[PDB]
Design a protein around this ligand. Sequence first.
Ligand code: CLA
Ligand code: XAT
Ligand code: LUT
Ligand code: BCR
Ligand code: BCR
Lengths: 83, 226, 210, 209
Amino acid sequence: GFIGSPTNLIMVASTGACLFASRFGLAPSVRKVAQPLKLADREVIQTTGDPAGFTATDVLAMGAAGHAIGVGIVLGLKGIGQL
Amino acid sequence: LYVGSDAAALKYLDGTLPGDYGFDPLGLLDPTVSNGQGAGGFVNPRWLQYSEVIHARWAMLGAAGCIAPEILGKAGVIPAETAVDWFRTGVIPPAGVYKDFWADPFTLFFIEVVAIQFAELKRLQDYKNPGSQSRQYFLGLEGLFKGSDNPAYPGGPFFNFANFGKTEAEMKKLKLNEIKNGRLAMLAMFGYGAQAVITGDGPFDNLLAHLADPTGANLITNLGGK
Amino acid sequence: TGSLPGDFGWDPLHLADTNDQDRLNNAMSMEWLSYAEVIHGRWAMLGAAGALSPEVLGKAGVIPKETGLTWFQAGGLDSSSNLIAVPFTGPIPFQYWTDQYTLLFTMLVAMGFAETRRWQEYKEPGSVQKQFFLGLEKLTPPSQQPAYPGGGFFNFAGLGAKDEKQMFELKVKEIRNGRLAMLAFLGFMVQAEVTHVGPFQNLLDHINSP
Amino acid sequence: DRPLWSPGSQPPAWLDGSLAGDYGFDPLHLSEEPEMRKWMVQAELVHARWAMLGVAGILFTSIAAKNGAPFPDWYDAGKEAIKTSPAPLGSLIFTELLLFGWVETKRLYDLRNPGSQGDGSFLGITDGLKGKENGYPGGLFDPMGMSKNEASFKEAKVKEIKNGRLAMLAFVGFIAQHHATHKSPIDNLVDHVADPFHVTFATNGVSVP
Ligand code: CLA
Ligand SMILES: CC(/C=C/C=C(C)/C=C/[C@@]12O[C@]1(C)C[C@@H](O)CC2(C)C)=C\C=C\C=C(C)\C=C\C=C(C)\C=C\[C@@]12O[C@]1(C)C[C@@H](O)CC2(C)C
Ligand SMILES: CC1=C[C@@H](O)CC(C)(C)[C@@H]1/C=C/C(C)=C/C=C/C(C)=C/C=C/C=C(C)/C=C/C=C(C)/C=C\C1=C(C)C[C@@H](O)CC1(C)C
Ligand SMILES: CC1=C(/C=C/C(C)=C/C=C/C(C)=C/C=C/C=C(C)/C=C/C=C(C)/C=C/C2=C(C)CCCC2(C)C)C(C)(C)CCC1
Ligand SMILES: CC1=C(/C=C/C(C)=C\C=C/C(C)=C/C=C/C=C(C)/C=C/C=C(C)/C=C/C2=C(C)CCCC2(C)C)C(C)(C)CCC1
C-alpha cells in the first residue's frame, strides 16, 4: 500500500513476474493451451497493438493472479513474523 | 481507430452505428440473440441503441446539472445558499435537503412524475408504433411528434428545429459526437457518484483537491492509502 | 506517400489514415492534420522564441533585467487558483502599461477575428476577401493550400517565387524545425514545472555540470 | 451583394436581405417558417425598441445624477420610486398591465392578420393604427411622415434596428456593470476615460475573483 513499503515492493514484483510469465511462455494464457506444456491457440481477442497473444482478458487474469499471490505472500510472511 | 475492439465481435456488426468502436466482449448486439417475432426480450439491437442514446442524453444533462451549480456558486454567479452539492439538493434527504424551496420536494416529485410519465409514455408508444403520437389529438402539437424511422432520432419541427446536418456526413459526425459526449458523461456521472459516496463533496471540490495536491488528494489517499 | 512535408512514415500509433478523409468536419483528415501540425509548430516556434528572449536579453544587458524575468512568471503561469498552467491568471510582479486582463480581452477579440478568418478561408477559399473589411481584405490573398497562403503580408521578403523543389525543401526544413520546437517546448515546460526556475538557469546548470 | 455576419458565409434561404439588418446571422435556423419569421421580426423589433427606451431613460437619469439632479442610480430606483409615489405597489403594476394588455393584444392580432385594426373598431379610426409593414405600423403612430418615401424608410428601418441592437447590448452591459462595480453607468464611463490603462473590467469589477 505505502509507496516504498516491503509489501508494496514484493507484490509489485509478483504482479510484474506474472505479467512477464504470461508474455513469454511460462504461465498459461489465452493463446496457451494443454495440460503438460503450452501450445499455440487462436487469437480469440484482438490484442489492440500488443505483439503476440496478449489481450485485455490476459492482463486482467494475470493482474488478478498477481494480486492474489501478493496478498497471500504478504499475509504468510506476516504470520511467520517476516516482511 | 477502434478502441479496444474485441475479435469475433465484428462478425455481426458493421459500421452503421454512430460510435461503433467494435467493443463487445460479452456480446449483446448479435442478431442471433433474441431472434424471432413479436416483443421478445429486452436484449435486442434496437432497444439497446435506444437505451444507450437515452442514457447518454440523461447522463449529459445530469453532468451539466452537477457541474453548473457548484461552478457558478464558486464565483458570484449563483448565491451561496443555492450553491449546494448535487446530492444535497433533496435527492437524498440523508445526504441533504434544501428546505428553502418554492414547494415541498414530494410535490415537485409528483409534478415531475406526471410530466415525465406523459413524456416517456408518449415516447414508448411512438417506439412501439412509429408516428402514432402524430395521429391522436394531444394539444395541437401533434405535427411536432411526427418522428422518424429511427426512434433514437425523431427530429421534426421541435426536437430538431435547427435542422442541423442537411448532408449525411454531418448527420454521421453529429451522431458520433453525441454518442461520444454521452459516453463521456456516463463515465463522468459514474465518477461523480463514486466521489459523492467516498469524499462526500462536490465533484469540483474533488477536482480542486486533486489540482492542489495530486498525491495528497487522489483515489489512493481517498480510502486511507499512501 | 511523399507529397506532404515530413512523410517519413513514422506513424506507430496509426492516429492518421482514417477512412473519412473529408476535409470539412471530422477533425481527422490528413490535410486538416497537416494544417494543425504546421500551425502548432509555428506557435511552438514563437513560444520558444518568447521563452528564450527575455532571460538572455537581460543577461546580455540589452533590455533591463527588471523586466527580463522568466517566461512563466511573466506569462501569468503561476499557482493562482491552483491551476498550475493557466495564462493571464497568476499575478505578475512587474507592472505593465495596462492590466493583464486588458490584453486578455484583446487576445479574445483579435485572435477570434483572425481564427475565424482562417476558418472561413479553410471552409471556402476566395470568399473571405469579398466582404468589406476596412480595406484589409486585400492584405491576405486567397490560396489553394490553407497552410501556405502567401501574398504580400505573409511573404514580405518574396522568397517564394523560386521553383517548387526549393519551396518543398524550405517547407520540410520548416516542419522539421517545428518538430524540434515541439520537443524543445515540451522540455521547456516540464523543466520549468519540475524546477520552478527559468530554462536559462537550468541550461547553465547543465552546461556547468553535464 | 450585402455585408454578412461572416466574410464568405452563405446567407440562409429564408433570409433574402429584404428585412432591416439582414446580415444573415441565423445559425440556429430560426424563423424558417414564414409565420415564425413574422414572429421573430416582431419580437426583435419590440425587444429592441423597449431596450432603447429603457437605455435612454437610464442614461438620462445617470447623466442628470452626475450633473447634480437628485436622481438615484438605475439599480433599485423602483424602491425609492414606490417610497415616493402616492400609488402603492401592486396597484400600479396592475394598472400598467391593464394598459399594456390592450395595445399588445392589438399588436398581436395585427401581426396575425394585417389590417385587422383598420376597420374602425377602436374609436372609428381606420387610416390610423394600420400596419404599413409587418413589424412597422403606420397612421396614428407616425404624426409626421418621413416614411412616405421608400428609400429613407428603408434607411430608417436599418438605422432603427442597428441602434436598437446596440442599445440592448448596452442594456446587458448596464446589468453587467452594476452587478460588477455597483456604480452609475455615467460614473463608470468617467472612470474609464479618467484612467483607461488601470480602470478596466477586471481591476475594479467582480469579473475576476
Ligand atoms: C432576444 C432578442 C433577439 C431576437 C428576438 C432576435 C431575432 C432575430 N434576429 Mg437578432 N440579434 C440579437 C438578438 C435578437 N435577435 C442580438 C443580441 C444581436 C447581436 C449579437 C443580433 C444580431 C442579428 C443580426 C446581425 C441579424 C439578426 C437576425 C435576426 C432574425 C433571425 C432569427 C434569430 O436570430 O433567431 C431568433 C433569436 C432568438 C430567439 C433570440 C434567442 C436569445 C437567447 C434565448 C438568449 C440566450 C443568452 C444570450 C447568449 C444572451 C446572453 C448575453 C450575451 C449578450 C453575451 C430574427 C428576426 C438576422 C435577420 O434576418 O435580421 C432580421 C440578422 O441578419 N440579429
Ligand atoms: C441581450 C438581449 C438578447 C440577446 C440575444 C442573443 C444574443 C441571441 C442570439 C442568437 O439569436 C441569434 C441572434 C442568432 C442565432 O444563430 C444564435 C443565437 C444565440 C440564438 C436582449 C436584451 C433586451 C433588453 C431590453 C428589452 C431592455 C429593456 C429595458 C427596460 C424596459 C428598462 C427599464 C427600467 O426598469 C429598469 C430595468 C431599471 C430602472 O432603473 C430604469 C427603467 C427604465 C425603469
Ligand atoms: C536545448 C534546451 C536546453 C534546456 O536547458 C531547456 C530547453 C528549453 C529544453 C532548450 C530547448 C530549446 C529549443 C528546443 C529551442 C527551439 C527553438 C526553435 C525551434 C526556434 C525556431 C525559430 C524559427 C525561426 C527563427 C524562423 C524564422 C522564419 C522566417 C523569418 C521565415 C520567413 C518570414 C516570415 C514567416 C515572416 C516575414 O515577416 C518575413 C519572412 C522572411 C518572409
Ligand atoms: C435543464 C434544466 C432543468 C430541467 C428541466 C426539465 C427536466 C424539464 C422537463 C419538463 C417536462 C418533462 C415537461 C412536460 C410538460 C408536459 C405537459 C405540459 C403536458 C401537457 C398535457 C396536456 C395538457 C394534455 C391534455 C390532454 C389532451 C391533449 C386531450 C384530452 C386529454 C388530456 C388532458 C390528456 C431545470 C429546470 C430542473 C433546472 C435548469 C436546467
Ligand atoms: C509494458 C507495456 C505497457 C504497460 C502496461 C502496464 C504497466 C499494465 C499494468 C496492468 C496492471 C498493473 C493490471 C493489474 C490488474 C490487477 C487486478 C485485476 C488485481 C486484483 C483484482 C481484484 C478484484 C482483487 C481481489 C482480491 C481481494 C480483494 C481479496 C482476495 C484476494 C484478491 C487479490 C483476489 C504500456 C501500455 C505502457 C506500453 C506497452 C506495453
